[PDB]
Protein backbone atom coordinates (compact mmCIF):
# COMPACT_ATOMS: atom_id res chain seq x y z
CA UNK A 1 0.00 0.00 0.00
CA UNK A 2 2.72 2.48 0.86
CA UNK A 3 5.11 1.92 -2.03
CA UNK A 4 2.28 2.13 -4.53
CA UNK A 5 0.58 5.06 -2.78
CA UNK A 6 -2.71 3.16 -2.38
CA UNK A 7 -5.12 2.53 0.50
CA UNK A 8 -7.31 -0.33 1.59
CA UNK A 9 -10.62 1.35 2.53
CA UNK A 10 -9.77 0.58 6.14
CA UNK A 11 -5.99 0.81 5.88
CA UNK A 12 -3.57 3.65 6.54
CA UNK A 13 -2.68 6.57 4.30
CA UNK A 14 1.01 7.28 3.70
CA UNK A 15 3.21 9.60 1.71
CA UNK A 16 4.11 8.94 -1.93
CA UNK A 17 7.68 7.63 -1.43
CA UNK A 18 8.16 8.72 -5.06
CA UNK A 19 6.81 12.25 -5.05
CA UNK A 20 7.14 12.85 -8.78
CA UNK A 21 4.57 11.34 -11.07
CA UNK A 22 4.53 14.58 -13.04
CA UNK A 23 6.83 13.42 -15.83
CA UNK A 24 4.74 12.03 -18.68
CA UNK A 25 6.00 11.36 -22.20
CA UNK A 26 3.30 12.14 -24.73
CA UNK A 27 3.20 8.90 -26.67
CA UNK A 28 0.91 6.48 -28.44
CA UNK A 29 1.35 3.54 -26.08
CA UNK A 30 -1.28 4.05 -23.39
CA UNK A 31 -3.59 6.24 -25.49
CA UNK A 32 -7.31 5.71 -24.94
CA UNK A 33 -8.01 4.76 -28.54
CA UNK A 34 -5.70 1.78 -28.00
CA UNK A 35 -7.22 0.57 -24.71
CA UNK A 36 -10.23 -1.66 -24.08
CA UNK A 37 -12.13 -0.80 -20.91
CA UNK A 38 -13.49 -3.93 -19.28
CA UNK A 39 -13.65 -4.08 -15.47
CA UNK A 40 -12.60 -0.90 -13.61
CA UNK A 41 -9.24 -2.14 -12.25
CA UNK A 42 -10.01 -1.41 -8.61
CA UNK A 43 -7.09 -0.75 -6.28
CA UNK A 44 -7.47 -4.06 -4.46
CA UNK A 45 -6.25 -5.61 -7.68
CA UNK A 46 -3.17 -3.39 -7.71
CA UNK A 47 -2.44 -4.38 -4.13
CA UNK A 48 -3.27 -8.02 -4.83
CA UNK A 49 -1.16 -8.70 -7.95
CA UNK A 50 1.19 -5.76 -7.74
CA UNK A 51 3.46 -6.46 -10.69
CA UNK A 52 0.65 -7.27 -13.11
CA UNK A 53 -2.01 -4.57 -13.01
CA UNK A 54 0.28 -1.85 -11.71
CA UNK A 55 2.57 -0.25 -14.27
CA UNK A 56 6.07 0.56 -12.99
CA UNK A 57 6.13 -0.74 -9.40
CA UNK A 58 9.06 -0.04 -7.16
CA UNK A 59 10.00 -1.54 -3.80
CA UNK A 60 6.97 -3.82 -3.82
CA UNK A 61 6.63 -7.14 -2.00
CA UNK A 62 4.96 -10.44 -2.75
CA UNK A 63 1.52 -10.72 -1.15
CA UNK A 64 1.49 -14.47 -0.05
CA UNK A 65 -1.64 -15.26 -2.13
CA UNK A 66 -3.80 -18.05 -0.71
CA UNK A 67 -4.59 -20.31 2.23
CA UNK A 68 -6.51 -23.59 2.58
CA UNK A 69 -10.00 -22.14 3.37
CA UNK A 70 -10.47 -23.36 6.93
CA UNK A 71 -13.56 -25.53 7.40
CA UNK A 72 -13.17 -25.57 11.21
CA UNK A 73 -16.45 -26.22 13.03
CA UNK A 74 -16.91 -26.09 16.80
CA UNK A 75 -19.64 -25.84 19.42
CA UNK A 76 -19.64 -23.21 22.16
CA UNK A 77 -23.33 -23.69 22.94
CA UNK A 78 -23.88 -26.85 25.00
CA UNK A 79 -21.21 -28.28 27.26
CA UNK A 80 -22.85 -31.72 27.13
CA UNK A 81 -22.81 -32.07 23.37
CA UNK A 82 -20.18 -34.74 22.68
CA UNK A 83 -16.76 -33.91 21.30
CA UNK A 84 -17.40 -35.72 18.01
CA UNK A 85 -20.82 -34.87 16.62
CA UNK A 86 -22.28 -34.33 13.17
CA UNK A 87 -23.12 -30.65 12.95
CA UNK A 88 -26.21 -29.64 10.93
CA UNK A 89 -24.01 -27.27 8.93
CA UNK A 90 -22.33 -30.25 7.27
CA UNK A 91 -23.75 -31.96 4.20
CA UNK A 92 -25.70 -35.20 4.71
CA UNK A 93 -23.51 -37.52 2.56
Amino acid sequence: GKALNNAIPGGPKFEPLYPREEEEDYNEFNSIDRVIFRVPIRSEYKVAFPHLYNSRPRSVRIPWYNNPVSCIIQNDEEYDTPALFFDPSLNPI
Partner: peptide, 27 residues
Protein backbone atom coordinates in the same frame (compact mmCIF):
# COMPACT_ATOMS: atom_id res chain seq x y z
CA UNK B 1 -11.31 2.02 -2.09
CA UNK B 2 -8.76 4.40 -3.57
CA UNK B 3 -9.17 3.92 -7.32
CA UNK B 4 -6.85 6.65 -8.50
CA UNK B 5 -9.04 9.50 -7.30
CA UNK B 6 -8.14 11.81 -4.48
CA UNK B 7 -4.72 13.24 -3.68
CA UNK B 8 -1.30 11.64 -3.45
CA UNK B 9 -1.87 12.33 0.26
CA UNK B 10 -3.45 15.14 2.21
CA UNK B 11 -0.63 17.08 3.80
CA UNK B 12 -0.07 20.35 2.00
CA UNK B 13 -3.56 20.45 0.53
CA UNK B 14 -5.08 21.73 3.80
CA UNK B 15 -8.25 19.75 3.12
CA UNK B 16 -9.29 16.50 4.78
CA UNK B 17 -8.74 14.49 1.61
CA UNK B 18 -12.25 13.10 2.04
CA UNK B 19 -13.55 11.78 -1.27
CA UNK B 20 -17.01 10.42 -2.00
CA UNK B 21 -18.74 9.08 -5.07
CA UNK B 22 -20.95 11.52 -6.93
CA UNK B 23 -24.61 10.54 -6.82
CA UNK B 24 -25.13 13.18 -9.53
CA UNK B 25 -23.93 11.71 -12.84
CA UNK B 26 -24.19 7.95 -13.32
CA UNK B 27 -26.56 6.78 -16.07
Amino acid sequence: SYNGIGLKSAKGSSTSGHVQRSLASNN
